[PDB]
Each structure stands twice: as structure tokens, then as C-alpha cells.
Structure 1
Amino acid sequence: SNNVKPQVFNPDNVMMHEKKDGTLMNEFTTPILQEVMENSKIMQLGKYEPMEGTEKKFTFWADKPGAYWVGEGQKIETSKATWVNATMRAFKLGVILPVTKEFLNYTYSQFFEEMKPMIAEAFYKKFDEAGILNQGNNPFGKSIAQSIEKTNKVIKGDFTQDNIIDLEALLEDDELEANAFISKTQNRSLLRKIVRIYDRNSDSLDGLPVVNLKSSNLKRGELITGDFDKLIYGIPQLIEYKIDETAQLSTVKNEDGTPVNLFEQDMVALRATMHVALHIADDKAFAKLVPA
């Protein structure tokens, strides 16, 4: 063959040193991030639980022992402390970044080191959206939004001060203090102009801090709150990176439909994986405001 024009790929996730018009990307400039990368909101709000298997067994207290008033020489009666079991399991996150070895020599030789922060951000966003919003084909079944559906613990209507109070009061109605608000950063437009109960000087709502989510699944009109100490997470495997120069990739295909052999085609790929786990210690601890 001796065909010299560059390889077309599908899904086209492969980084390449030359474009099909013949532009070789020599003298390339290292990108700079526009914003700053987000941390995990679950890891910010939830309780950590040291875990070393892929699964954990909890014990929590449930019933406190009582006490009695006894007259002089009257019989002291007995009482029982009680506990309840709970369990949480991990699931695996992972991604692969395929690269043509010319790109790693001539375009951007630090690429796989400069990607590690962005890979971590991708996993944190994937974790938050799975555990809070029940989105992105979450594996746990356990989630905040799925708890609120089960309890049906939902206020209907707009961001009136009465509804912002009723939202929190629906947790006080079971002796739980709210501890934070989860908000779509776009909906300050509503929380500003009600009467004030909000302030932007801190981003707090009735003195509790607001945490912004930053994804398309949480709409304008919706607000979430709860006792976030009842949300528990663990990480059996901190992110592990493996770089490979010879494996096949089956998910990316050549122009003719063949899998991508990294050895024949002179390529490199970075695999990253992480194990992460979620538990909701009390499904009543979260409540939501939803537009009608």
C-alpha cells in the first residue's frame, strides 16, 4: 500500500499530530484552562468512611436506653440499647485516552501528565451526578434524588420565602436540621429577588451554605437540601494510571471497521481507573423544592 495520508478513526477520540488537510501541528502551544477545575461536591459534603474491601458493613445506634424515677428501696427497672446494620459497595470508574506516538513526540509531549487533573475532575463530576442527581446511569441505586422520590418528600412551586421555609421545615418535621443547600448556579436569579432570606455575600440561604452543582441535569427551578452528615462515601482505590503501548482497543475502530492495535499502528494509550462507594444513612434526611 504505502498509503501515507493519516488514519481516520471512529469515535475519533485519537489524538493526532497531523490533520487530514496536511497541517502538521509542530510548534504547538500548551493549552491553559479557562475556569478552574471543580472538586467533588459529594466528597465536600459527605462523611468519609475508611474502606479497604469493595464492601463495608456499618453498625449505627437506633434506640437509646431509658431511665426511671425510683423511690427509696423501689426496684430499678431495665432498659435496652438497640442498633441497626447498613452496608455499602464500591463501583469502578475508568477512561482511556488514545494517542498517536507522533503526537506524544512532536505536538505535546507532557500530554499524559497534564491530563491527570482533568481525568480526576471527570471522575468527580461523574460521581457527584450519580449520587446526588441519580443521573448518568448510576450503579448504586442509592441516591439523594431516588430517596426523595421514595419518601415523596417534595414541595411543589416557585421560590417563595414561604416555600424556602417550608422546604427546610419539612426536615424539621422529623427532628433533622438541614446542613446545606444544593443549587443550580443559574437560579440565583430567583433566590435573589424574594422577601431577605438569601445573601450572595456568602452564598447562603437562611444561614446555611449553598453548594453549587455545575451540570445540565439540575434545572433552574429546583432546590435540594438535607442533613448531609447522613450521606457517606468511601474510596477503596485512589486513581491508578496505567500507560500501555501494545494493547488492542476494541471500542475505537479504524476507517475500515477494524479495532485499533496500538503496536501495529504505533500508538499509546493511558488507562485510568478508580473505585468509589456511596451510602445514604437515612433516606428521610433530604427534601426538595420542585416547580409545578
Structure 2
Amino acid sequence: SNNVKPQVFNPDNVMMHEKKDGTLMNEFTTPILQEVMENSKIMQLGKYEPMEGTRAFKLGVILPVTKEFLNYTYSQFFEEMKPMIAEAFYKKFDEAGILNQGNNPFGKSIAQSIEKTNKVIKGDFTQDNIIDLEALLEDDELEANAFISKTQNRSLLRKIVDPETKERIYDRNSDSLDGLPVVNLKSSNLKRGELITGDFDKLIYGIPQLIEYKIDETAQLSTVKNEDGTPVNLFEQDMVALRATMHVALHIADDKAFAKLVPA
């Protein structure tokens, strides 16, 4: 529109060419990847299950962009944002399935399995506590397959050495503990001193609908209010939006297959 102050949106999720202070991102240099992509950990550890139809639940998001931004500031925005959305979905799914966090829709999670079976070790990281953690699984004829850890505790793992072989139990190059691979979770909910392990083949997942993307220049975003409170009309307000959706399903076949180590 002829508005010389930029449009304030509520919530402020719309991408804009002009900042609130009047700065204009003309000739704007494309951002660069300061971090690597975080793959889904339950899609890495767990067992895939061929599934037809839906239990499943639907993930989704919408990204609105001001077409000024899409023309002058960053033309390829939607092509470079697609994988970042996929990462957001993987993180939401991992956080729901593992930690029972983020308003998970399933009634199932590893955190709930552990809280039910009380398979928790109070203690600092020591070779004896690692062996006890593993024995909590082998007690029930199940053998540990991998470890889940907050990367910030490698400082603790390097301090553990086998007093028989007199060598590090943790291979800091392989990132494997006692010969088992350790995967790192970037989420803020798993605390520094916490470690999880289990036979992840007992954790089953399915994906009835792979991540689908649709770009639209016409819809109305009921959820995004103009400053006056009217809903955003993409066509009249010269705006564009990307919709992404996915269906994921999670199942835990045996909830005693998981154990957790936590600080005393």
C-alpha cells in the first residue's frame, strides 16, 4: 500500500524488506550457514514401519513473506528455507517422541516409558554407572543399541577410563561410548548431566505423508492480524506464503527397553 511506515503484523512473523527503523535491505547479501543441519534422531535410531493411511498426527507451518522482500531483499528465500523447515519438523518430532515435550500429541514417548518402568540411575558419569545403566537393559534380556546425549557432556565422558585396559572408554573421535554410538541432541530440554540408552529397534515410527510444500499468493491468513486487527489478505496486501505439512506416527513396542542416567 501507500503506507510509508511499514505494516506492523501480529504476530510479527511476516518477512519484510523494510525494518521498523526504516532501513531498507536493498542489494542484501545472502545469509550463510553458520551451523550444520540437525537430522531427526528417532528417524536415525528407530525402526521404520511401512504404513498405509493413518496412529498418525499432522505437523505443519506457514511462512508469510512480503513480496517486496521476495523481489528486492532475497529472491531465492523460499528455495533456501524449505530445508530449514524440514529441520524444524525433525526437531519437533524428536522432542515429542524422546522427551515428551512440546505438547506431543501421542500418548507414547520414551520419557513416559522410563518414568513408568522407573529405569533410572542416580549418579555421576563413571564406568561403573555406565555399566549399571547398560545392565538395566540386559537384566530383561534386551541389549543396548546406542546412546542419546547432550553434546555438552563430552567433557565428562573424556574423564572415564577403564582401569583394567587403562584406556578411555569414550572414543572422542568416533563419538562412541563403550563401543556404542552416541547421538547428540541439540534441544535445550535434555540437561547437561543426563544420558539415555535403549534398544531403539523397539521404537517404531511411520510417515504416511512425506513433507509436502505449497506456495500460495491468494489465501487469507486468519491467524495473522494487521495492526488494525483485520486478517491478512495475501492478494490485496501483495503478499506470499509457503505452507508445509507432514504426517508422522510413533509407536513404542516394548516400554522396558529404555533406561536413563541422571545426576544425583
TM over 0.5: yes
Measure how far apart 1:2 and its partner are. Answer: 5.0
Q: What's the CA shift for 1:17? A: 1.2
Cα offset for 1:3?
3.6
- How far, CA to CA, are the matches of 2:3 and 2:169 in structure 1? 68
Larger deviation, residues 250-259 vs 127-136: 250-259
CA offsets 1:66-85 (integer angstroms, 9 cap, x no match): xxxxxxxxxxxxxxxxxxxx
CA distances 1:5-26 after superposition (whole Å, capped 9, x unpaired): 2111122110111223332211
Shift of residue 221, structure 1, vs aligned partner: 0.8
Give how far 1:152 is off: 0.7
Structure 2 counterpart of 1:26: 26
Distance in 2 between the 1:13 and 1:3 partners? 19
Q: How far apart, CA to CA, are the structure 2 residues paired with 1:217 and 1:139?
A: 18
Shift of 1:226: 0.5
| Cα distance, 1:244 vs structure 2 | 1.2
Partner of 2:262: 290
- Indicate how the Cα distance of structure 1 residues 245 and 174 shifts in structure 2: closer, same or farther if over 3 A, else same: same
5+ residue gaps in structure 2? 162-167
SS in 2 for 1:155: strand
Match of 1:271 among 243, 249, 253: 243
Q: Give 1:77's aligned residue.
A: none
Shift of residue 158, structure 1, vs aligned partner: 1.0
Query: SS at the partner of 1:20?
Result: coil
Q: Report sequence identity in percent.
A: 100
Distance 1:167 1:104 in 2: 52
CA-to-partner distance for each residue in 1:217-273, whole Å, 9 max, x for gaps?
000111100001111111111111111112111222111222211122111100000
Residue 17 (str. 1) matches residue 17 (str. 2): yes
How far apart in 1 are the matches of 2:3 and 2:15? 20
Bigger mean CA deviation after superposition, 251-260 or 208-217: 251-260
Separation in 2, partners of 1:52, 1:152: 34
Q: CA 1:260–1:193 in 2, change beyond 3 Å: closer, same or farther?
A: same
Give the direction of change, closer, same or farther, for the CA distance of 1:192–1:225 in structure 2 (3 Å limit).
same
Q: How large is the RMSD of aligned CA atoms in angstroms?
A: 1.3
| Per-residue Cα deviation, 1:123-175 (whole angstroms, up to 9, x for no partner) | 01111111111111111111111100001111111112111110000111011
Deviation above 3 Å: which 4+ runs of structure 1?
none
Deviates more, 1:3-12 or 1:207-216: 3-12
Equivalent residue for 2:106, pick from 130, 133, 140: 140
Secondary structure at the aligned position of 1:127 is classed as helix
When structure 1 is superposed on structure 2, of 258-267 and 215-224 the one drifting more is 258-267
Alignment of 1:1-292 (within 5 A): 2-53=2-53, 89-195=55-161, 196-292=168-264
Q: Residue 132 of structure 1 aligns to a residue in which SS?
A: helix
More off after superposition, 189-198 vs 140-149: 189-198
Cα distance per residue 1:183-217 (max 9 Å; x no partner): 00001111111233222121111111111111100
